[PDB]
Amino acid sequence: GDEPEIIAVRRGMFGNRDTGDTSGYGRLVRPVALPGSTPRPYGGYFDAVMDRLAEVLGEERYAMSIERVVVYRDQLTIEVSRVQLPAVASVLRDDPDLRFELCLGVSGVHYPEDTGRELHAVYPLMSITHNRRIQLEVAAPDADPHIPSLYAVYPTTDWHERETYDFFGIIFDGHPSLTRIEMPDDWEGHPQRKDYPLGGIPVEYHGAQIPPPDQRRSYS
């Protein structure tokens, strides 16, 4: 790692997702990289949090567990390597200096262009005792969408691992019962995946109809 994480490659001026309306403007190639690894002097209490996490975790264990550290908009994200998630979560919750007792949930986000890391689970953690907060990010490939479930560490992640599963298919291995919570159990597909179509219908008008927004042209 240590390089910028490109989630999508945007080519052509004006955010055209296809050939483009005006000729000659489609040759730009701008990769869409999320913020990369932050230089070590993190801001505010992030430095203390990371130093404590690296002290509690062995240097080898820390290097194996923490895949990346990002400080964006004065918010700390820790790209935690899959598999090692339960260990670092336990350390964060239990370590007196960290004491991130309040896990606010799990959010799924799909990056279909992020090879080997399509599905990200975001764990916003807050320490009331220290009035701190951080986010963990766990990436998983579309091929093996498995993440260690934090049910033992953060029971609140229950239903969240379910919602995130229901909407993305992340399997959260070890969850007591990873059953669809929003969509019906007979439902096919995971709606919030980018490949899942919006599933709208045309809007009816006198003599015309407007297709759903996902079918019509857009610029990003």
Partner: protein
């Protein structure tokens, strides 16, 4: 074992808000196991957001957790602004109005919670008095925004429009009357023997339970922990307001109800402070590259873009016309990145994970709605008690299912 029924509180039930499905194993009439069934109000708002621009998904987010529209809007707009790095550029008047509207909305949401809880617990007139107060609050909201619910008034970088000239007077009248009229509602419930017997000691949940389930809002603060995202992790300039975090130590339904009742008065105090600090000025960022170009004004033909703005864009300013056209059609472009922004909605920490891929549409917008997490406490606060106690416990959780399902 074979002597206990299993019943559906079901979506269609007066206390289940029409879409919540409590599945209760009752041994006689004691709840033995309490499964929670969700998704009957799933709406695809989170996915449908992805096909609309910024300043447009506002109209979507205001409709999840529809009892706290301004809170959803404020969380969304704070996320967008933080992604833009604009949070420090928002006009002071816009932030003050945001705080004022969030606190009035807190009063309104608590009023709905008290109304529906009293109705569920038989307090018939509680619903009517709570909605009588909420009617004045919604009159103010309608005058400010032109809508009674699902307002899209708070926009990325400020507000949709400035306050009408009469708005300040109406809000001052609210500050004057809300305590007196809330006195009527408190008299019906606060010290009522039946109300206390019906809620005191019911739906108990210790601080350990709140942490384990990640509960927040009045449920958590009924445990005595003064956790409030307004004091801890301040936003929208809440740090400039003198108010006390309401917290109780009963850890039960009545404690949560009292917390809401006192939060109404704290919100009244914060609104008085907002009026004191409200000063004339812009309500949208000065950066024309991001500022919402619309300038709504009233006339004999109704509400529409002000004739001065029409003159500027269609008559003299080519740059103005281009900016209006683009900011209205495609909208702003938000630099790529992730941001988790949290506010203290009436029901707890309303969090928003917002991911932008550099485009004109939100790449991903997830609401950690406090009701979704709080409903995980139904098993703790219902198992062991009677179904009558389960009703009170669920009402105390005050779940708005729009936020639950989204």
């Amino acid at each position: 074992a074979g002597e206990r029924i299993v019943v559906n509180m079901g979506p269609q039930h007066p206390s289940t808000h029409g879409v919540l499905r409590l599945i209760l194993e009752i041994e006689g009439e004691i709840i033995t196991e309490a499964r929670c069934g969700i998704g009957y109000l799933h709406t695809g708002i989170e996915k449908n957001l992805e096909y609309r621009n910024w300043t447009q998904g506002v109209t979507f987010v205001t409709r999840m957790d529809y009892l706290s529209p301004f809170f959803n809007e404020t969380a969304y707009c704070l996320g967008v602004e933080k992604l833009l790095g604009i949070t420090d550029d928002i006009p002071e008047r816009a932030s003050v109005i945001r705080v004022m509207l969030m606190e009035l909305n807190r009063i309104s949401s608590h009023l709905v919670a008290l109304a529906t809880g009293g109705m569920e617990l038989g307090a018939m007139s509680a619903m009517f008095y709570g909605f009588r107060e909420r009617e004045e609050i919604l009159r103010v909201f309608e005058s400010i925004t032109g809508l009674r619910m699902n307002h899209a008034y708070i926009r990325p970088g400020g507000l949709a429009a400035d306050l009408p000239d009469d708005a300040i007077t109406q809000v001052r009248r609210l500050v004057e009357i809300l305590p007196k009229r809330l006195k009527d509602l408190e008299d019906l419930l606060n010290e009522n023997y039946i109300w206390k017997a019906r809620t005191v000691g019911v739906g108990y949940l210790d601080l350990t339970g709140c942490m384990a389930l990640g509960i927040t809002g009045p449920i958590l603060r009924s445990t005595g922990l003064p956790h409030d995202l307004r004091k801890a992790q301040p936003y929208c300039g809440y740090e400039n307001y003198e108010f006390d975090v309401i917290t109780d130590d009963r850890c039960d339904s009545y404690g949560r109800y009292i917390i809401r009742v006192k939060e109404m008065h704290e919100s009244v105090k914060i609104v008085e402070q907002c009026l004191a600090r409200l000063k004339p000025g812009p309500v949208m960022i000065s950066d024309k590259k991001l500022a919402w170009p619309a300038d709504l004004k009233l006339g004999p033909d109704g509400l529409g873009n002000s004739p001065e703005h029409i003159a500027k864009i269609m008559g003299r300013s080519m740059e103005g016309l281009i900016h209006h056209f683009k900011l209205v059609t495609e909208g702003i472009r938000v630099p790529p990145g992730q941001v988790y922004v949290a506010v203290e909605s009436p029901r707890g920490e309303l969090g928003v994970h917002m991911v932008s891929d550099g485009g004109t549409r939100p790449y991903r917008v997830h609401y950690r709605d406090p009701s979704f997490t709080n409903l995980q406490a139904v098993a703790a606060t219902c198992e062991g008690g009677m179904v009558a106690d389960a009703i009170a416990a669920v009402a105390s959780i005050d779940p708005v299912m729009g936020g639950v399902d989204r």
